[PDB]
Amino acid sequence: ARTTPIARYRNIGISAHIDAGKTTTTERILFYTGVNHKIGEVHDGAATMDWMEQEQERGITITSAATTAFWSGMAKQYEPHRINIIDTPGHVDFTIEVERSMRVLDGAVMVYCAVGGVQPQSETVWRQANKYKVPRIAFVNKMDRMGANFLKVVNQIKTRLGANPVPLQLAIGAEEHFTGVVDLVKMKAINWNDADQGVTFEYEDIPADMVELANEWHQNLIESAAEASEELMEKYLGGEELTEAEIKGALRQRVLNNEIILVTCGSAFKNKGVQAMLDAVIDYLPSPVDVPAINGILDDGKDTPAERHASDDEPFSALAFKIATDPFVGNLTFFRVYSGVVNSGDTVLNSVKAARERFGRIVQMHANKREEIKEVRAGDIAAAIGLKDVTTGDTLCDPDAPIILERMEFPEPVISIAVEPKTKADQEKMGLALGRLAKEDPSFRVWTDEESNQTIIAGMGELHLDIIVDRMKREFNVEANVGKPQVAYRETIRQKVTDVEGKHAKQSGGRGQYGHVVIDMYPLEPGSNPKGYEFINDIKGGVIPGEYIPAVDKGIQEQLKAGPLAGYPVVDMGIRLHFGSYHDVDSSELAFKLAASIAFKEGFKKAKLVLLEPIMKVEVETPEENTGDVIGDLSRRRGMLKGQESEVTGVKIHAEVPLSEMFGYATQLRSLTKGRASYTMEFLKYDEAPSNVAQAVIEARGK
Amino acid sequence: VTSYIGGEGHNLQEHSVILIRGGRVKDLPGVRYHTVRGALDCSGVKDRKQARSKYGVKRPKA
Amino acid sequence: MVTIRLARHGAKKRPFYQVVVADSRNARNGRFIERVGFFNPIASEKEEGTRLDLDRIAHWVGQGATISDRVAALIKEVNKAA
Amino acid sequence: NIKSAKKRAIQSEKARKHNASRRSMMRTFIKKVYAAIEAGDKAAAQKAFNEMQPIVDRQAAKGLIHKNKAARHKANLTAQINKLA
Amino acid sequence: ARYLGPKLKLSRREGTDLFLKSGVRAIDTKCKIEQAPGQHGARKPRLSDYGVQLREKQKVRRIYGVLERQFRNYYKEAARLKGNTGENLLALLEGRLDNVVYRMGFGATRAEARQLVSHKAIMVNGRVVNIASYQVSPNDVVSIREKAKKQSRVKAALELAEQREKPTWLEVDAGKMEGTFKRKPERSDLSADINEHLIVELYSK
RNA sequence: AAAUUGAAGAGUUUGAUCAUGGCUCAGAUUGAACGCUGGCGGCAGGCCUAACACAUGCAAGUCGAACGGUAACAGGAAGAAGCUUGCUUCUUUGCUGACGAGUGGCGGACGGGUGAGUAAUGUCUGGGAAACUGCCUGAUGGAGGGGGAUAACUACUGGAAACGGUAGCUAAUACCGCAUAACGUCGCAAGACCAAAGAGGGGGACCUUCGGGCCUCUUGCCAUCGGAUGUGCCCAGAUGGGAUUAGCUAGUAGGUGGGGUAACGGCUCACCUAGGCGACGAUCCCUAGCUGGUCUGAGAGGAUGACCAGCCACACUGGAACUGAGACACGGUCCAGACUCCUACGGGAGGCAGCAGUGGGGAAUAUUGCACAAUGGGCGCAAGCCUGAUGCAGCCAUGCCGCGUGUAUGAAGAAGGCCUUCGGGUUGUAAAGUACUUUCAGCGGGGAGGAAGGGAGUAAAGUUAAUACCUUUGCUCAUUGACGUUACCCGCAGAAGAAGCACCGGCUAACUCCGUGCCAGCAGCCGCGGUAAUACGGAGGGUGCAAGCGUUAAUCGGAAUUACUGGGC
């Protein structure tokens, strides 16, 4: 029934900076495992992982693509292990994809360019993998490129990321003369064949051009493995060379418990090092069964709510990590089954929403290709069709299974735009498209701001948002134009107090009712009340009838609620009905509302109060080299600074900036900090700002 | 076609989509249809409490 | 193959069959040659459960009509031999 | 095709070949009879009729033509031969 | 499908007593029966043909605790059945299980009879029946179930069922808590103030 | 016995009247949608528009009791793994159960879908003659004998796949001639001529090359005549609008002969005749599936053809034929056209108007569900397999029906609201309070019916020669339900979990106050609002219906307002 044993499963991700070689390494993996009959290349769009039209055209991976391969070895050493690889996008503008996958995966191959080595998004995916506490190996790709330096990149991994990398496969020859790799356990030099596409290779005897460096690093590898358990330490110190099997086992223990990252090297585009990397994956990275059982909660926790072994004997539990659009069935949910067995057509429970879902179809994935499978076992990645309300990080399981797992956090989108269709006969269709897209992508939100009729689109970056826009144009076609979000201001009086009046000639002899009010407005102070409206009752001269003496403030609510100046609200005003006149028979509230409106209008006219723009507080973490640049940008922007701080790993600046401004501030921040700085917003109390648009918006409509 | 907007206060702009039902105004000679309030982003009449099913107004808590 | 079979009229969860001699190609509820009696599997009272038009069924069998398994069993039960 | 009606497609192809062969054989013998009728030599026409009679009878029995078709051929050609005098 | 509300409003809107209360006290003591429920009940506007027809139909509907859909179905059945449509309609209304329950006893009001029927506390002709509109046929034995007799409401209602005209078509066994339905009530066996022809012409309108 | 017992009017032209004449309203119905609201159950209904385009998974297979046979499993046998001469299973043998692929038989033309086309190439009614009909069934016969293949398979080999190429063979219930065939075809007669297939169970004799022959039984095979079923064909009538469409037709109308059909026939051809249709509406244009029926009506009628059943037509568009009893074939072939998809670029594949489902269109119509347990259908001797037919489940107050949301008592006629003549009236026995019940929903426990059959054993006779095999009928034995935590019944609890919508000027049932003041607005018709609005909006109160209500759309009625019943100038 089970086509492959539990132990022979390797769930891994390929994570790195942009254009580090993830998709190329995946393509060579597929070629050398035989599922792909042509190697192809990304820049010509022939990569299988880059299946979306945007990926094919632009040469980048925008989606986490999961596929599966069978690997025996360079020498067919082992029975075919099944590697469930996921090619993740290294763009900072798609970070949820890598976080999404990396939650469920068991290992990560971190790719590093031999020239650049550790880069900003390599550090980003490093942090994500570290917080998920996953084992890593490293693949120094791009060894065929001038300036490549494997040892220097390893030292960059050591110094920058904070790791203690362990060399495992040193490089023979120069950059363009990249002949192959010498393994630091076998003492064999794999040289790949250039006539064919690197499918074949030869083992050579580490020629004299490098026998000292290899010997030294092999001794370092031996002692690194020896520093794993006392049984290894005692014999190492006794002075017999550790056998390769025990070395590999100890290094595997170090990999599982994250003491080290085993770094190999290769050149995927020149077809070298990929099979060696695959054997490194098989030998050193965990399987679904070679880790302590996963954990969750159950009924407000317990001593041990859940300990789910990687085995079929136990009730089904899984995690639905990816949600993807499908034009023909409306959804496709990629889930990893952590423990148990499920079959097509079976019913399960989403422990989060606590509802029944029927697995309409279960398929195995190969890029866009789907193949139907009858059942899924523990430690296996598959895609379900028929789920209709399940979201990312949702636990699908049998009754009495863990409820909440670690996946309940996502990044916050940073770029915000306002999207409007070219044809305004397209509002509902575009809204539906954007809603479903938001449902697939947690880090992307769409909302109609209610101060205007615009619809605001918030994402992780400008690349994220224009990818969303053009994919919306292509699939479920609706055109769209981007613009700027509108601005919600507020007013406040500039310390004005008077005994203003309000009087309308409603009597006219025969109408039978009328009234007159005399009020006072004062500003309290800039932001000392959660209630922007204030009232202090002082109606003494001609006290109106007693049924709504205190209720002549809920009626004045609406004047402050919207539009004394340019249709915008006010804060800090406090109203005080001091005098007035009436008749003590029928004091019509509706008739008094006209007097209230005229009193408010005359009061504003005599106040000549001004507008407060929306200024929020922005807190930015940046390295301590671009501090001057970022604060200079914030100062060229009409923004103020608050507080100086110096983090151990950076510097935190705090500033006050308008909302009409800092449109697309994330891209500018990334430009001026090498994409290695973050910012957050919290909407602090407003401030005065001279803007010519405040009168423009109201004078566009004449008087 | 020309259609009436019943009730007090609406939000119909120059390109808002709306739902049109039969009827007539009978003193606007030429208006033979009615706009269904509270349907197709034509919000229901504000502060309405009687004949509330017409005018697309929902039941207040009260 | 002019079968004699049960037509399954009646209601939901309360079947009631018409014993019809019908050409086998036509649908169960569809075209039939004639109706010869009825059957009610849920009739569990003093009321009659089944009735069959024995002479007409014999005429059609002599003509060559086929008999379904249930029609045969119900004819056996109608005859007091079983 | 989706289901295994491809087997019936193959069978229909083979039966088309066989039936076409036998039907054309029938038709050329009938053509011989008609050509003899046009020539007027009742001896050769009668011989051709006697040679085609088993052919059409056997093919009608096998089912390539129908008994009515075979009888129509025989009756029409016998009438032609009788008027040939 | 039941009028859950004040009953004396209905009684004084119809004017006469609809028998919607027990005999514990007098109707005039329980409500101002003379006028109508509203704040404009003192005034007596002139009624119309439609007004009197509707008032008669509503009086019958409120007497028997029936809604308009079921009452229209009853009228259709009465018009189908041979004989006087009004007499047929009244016989159909008297055939209701809650109606016969009330007319025999077992409940001081027809709503109480409806609870007794619906609560599976009534057995008709051996079969337990909990449908208030279950039409009882001639020679049917309507009996209380076990584990429901001798309780306060039942005994009080049986005792209170005295001091009123005994139906001449039931022959109830009050002690043993079952009665018979020997034959359908005739026109002379009912109130005789209710004009059935008014309802007939209303529903033929 | 009974099959019906059936016909209502009102508002509005006027200063007022009567006629006439429109408009509007009161009723019933929905495949309805929208607004507000919404407890449950039963039974039905559920893309009316784009016959618009379709991803994905299923919708048609079965037979080893026709055959060659052995890809997977199992059983035996023959052994130098395991091995304590085996319990711990290495290999071989189609040998037996079974069985992928293959030949072959039947099915696939049924079942399911849609109404695009079709206005008479159709449908309905009633007849007729020139027909064929697999399976089913009755009667009578035959079922010597022989041949050459070829698939699979073997060898080589092309191709990414789809799928093939070159040789070698090996089977048949595949194909082919001969033998024989007549109440059969041809012919007036003489006479001439046409078919086949064999397989399975058991078996005391007797003969064997342990293949069996041979005797039986049950199937199948072939010929003819029938029956039944089904199909084909012909005729008369009926079956929409338009004359702001009066001429149409040249294989056109008929005859002779040849051919063709299963069958008659201009069905087709070669000639001869110059006809035929049309004011009883041809032709042309638009529309349209038709019917039993459905809604309405007292009828006559009008409108309609959703569900269900019958017939027809279609299957991406056009055409054509092949096979077969039956097709010019949804899930077959070929070609031509557009579209879609895979391609390793050389090629290849497909047609949801089958069940679901997606996009689009639209005011609007559902699940990418569970079983073949019922009944049918296909195949098979059966077992059994398949069956998106069918039985059920889900979603939708879409409709019809039923029930519930408490019952009795309760006058401080409480408070609060509203009105007021300021006395009071009203909300109102309503609430609160007291007692009582627990349907339904929620939990826990029992529990039918839809289940007939099938399998194994045995008894009886039947059969035979054989108390064997095989039918037919008793007798038992363990058994088969998706629905299903079924219907249904019993227990726990506490009035708890369950009321809204429209209207209140007249038509039309239900009236006062306040705020606005020809403004805001209402309106089905008449009409209301410009300072005391029962006609707008809010409140109180009432009226109608009620898990519905109201709004809009559509048919009929009212409308005797297309008047045949039944009108006028």
Ligand SMILES: Nc1nc2c(ncn2[C@@H]2O[C@H](COP(=O)(O)OP(=O)(O)O)[C@@H](O)[C@H]2O)c(=O)[nH]1
């Ligand atoms: N020279 C060279 N080019 C490489 C190598 N690996 C990848 N590339 C190319 O660099 C570009 C980006 O690499 P790609 O595989 O798309 O990586 P990803 O965008 O990080 O997933 C593509 O044009 C690749 O063909 C390598 O080792 N050497």
Ligand SMILES: [Mg+2]
């Ligand atoms: Mg890439």
Ligand SMILES: [Mg+2]
């Ligand atoms: Mg690039």
Ligand SMILES: [Mg+2]
């Ligand atoms: Mg002829």
Ligand SMILES: [Mg+2]
């Ligand atoms: Mg109801």
Ligand SMILES: [Mg+2]
């Ligand atoms: Mg289509």
Ligand SMILES: [Mg+2]
């Ligand atoms: Mg199936």
Ligand SMILES: [Mg+2]
């Ligand atoms: Mg087989």
Ligand SMILES: [Mg+2]
């Ligand atoms: Mg041979």
Ligand SMILES: [Mg+2]
């Ligand atoms: Mg044969």
Ligand SMILES: [Mg+2]
């Ligand atoms: Mg005409």
Ligand SMILES: [Mg+2]
């Ligand atoms: Mg049409």
Ligand SMILES: [Mg+2]
């Ligand atoms: Mg009439």
Ligand SMILES: [Mg+2]
């Ligand atoms: Mg339809």
Ligand SMILES: [Mg+2]
């Ligand atoms: Mg053919």
Ligand SMILES: [Mg+2]
């Ligand atoms: Mg077909």
